[PDB]
């Protein structure tokens, strides 16, 4: 086509989706990770995670307002990944890298799994 | 903070949101523009438009499944802007620029209004 493109549009959209999440606006699901609860937009979770994409395209699970993750999932690792989904920024630290990588593998977030593998390899 | 950032994350999210729109997945509103109907995600519309942001933060309108736009709004102009919301690409042409700019003013999409003004000024 002969379209023009606004470079900052995708980033501005994601910024506004994170503002709606922070104010709990039109959030339609709560993700339960052991004792912790995280409110989010199903569409953003599906857009970021192969696991959520599979869950919310399922004809019965698409209608659930609560999703319980596997008990082995670490709440902090999930929180870090949810923040990444809504911002593009990943808070990867020596103290959390193992939990973040395991959570990213479970959530099927291949680019996160890739950077965790590389950061771990460099420390070996 | 000491976060790392994935450059293509926002673009990849927007691409997946457009794929969900094309397959009509988790769309929660229909925008009526005279004889034409457009299915979308309320969160994406709010993230892109000052008008939709105001509509869907309203305590009664946030729950509507149908929104009717002003009868002066051109369906093609709306279609072009909805495509822009989900892709960052604007199909701006001599034959549609007046309708696109008027629709962008109504929808409160300031960056689109700005490029239309500049493209019109150059042709004068």
């Amino acid at each position: 086509d002969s379209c023009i493109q606004f470079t900052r549009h995708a980033s501005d959209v994601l910024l506004n989706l994170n503002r709606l999440r922070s104010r709990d606006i039109l959030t339609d699901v709560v993700i339960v990770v052991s004792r912790e609860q995280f409110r989010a937009h199903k569409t953003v979770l599906m857009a970021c995670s192969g696991l959520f994409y599979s869950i919310f395209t399922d004809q019965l699970k698409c209608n659930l307002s609560v999703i319980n993750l596997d008990p082995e999932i670490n709440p902090e690792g999930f929180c870090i990944l949810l923040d990444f989904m809504y911002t593009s920024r990943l808070n990867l630290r020596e103290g959390n890298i193992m939990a973040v990588m395991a959570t990213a593998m479970y959530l099927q977030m291949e680019h996160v799994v890739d950077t965790c593998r590389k950061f771990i390899k460099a420390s070996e | 903070d000491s976060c790392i950032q994935f450059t293509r994350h926002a673009s990849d999210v927007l691409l997946n949101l457009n794929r969900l729109r094309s397959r009509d997945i988790l769309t929660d509103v229909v925008i009526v523009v005279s004889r034409e109907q457009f299915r979308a995600h309320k969160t994406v519309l709010m993230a892109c438009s000052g008008l939709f942001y105001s509509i869907f933060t309203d305590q009664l309108k946030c729950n509507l499944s149908v929104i009717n736009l002003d009868p002066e709004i051109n369906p093609e102009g709306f279609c072009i802007l909805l495509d822009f919301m989900y892709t960052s690409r604007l199909n701006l042409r001599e034959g549609n620029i007046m309708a696109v700019m008027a629709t962008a003013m109504y929808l409160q999409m300031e960056h689109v209004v700005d490029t239309c003004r500049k493209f019109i000024k150059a042709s004068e």
């Binding site: 023009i4 493109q5 606004f6 470079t7 | 690409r89 604007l90 960056h111 490029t115």
Partner: peptide
């Protein structure tokens, strides 16, 4: 704005 750019030519993509």
């Amino acid at each position: 704005w750019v030519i993509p």
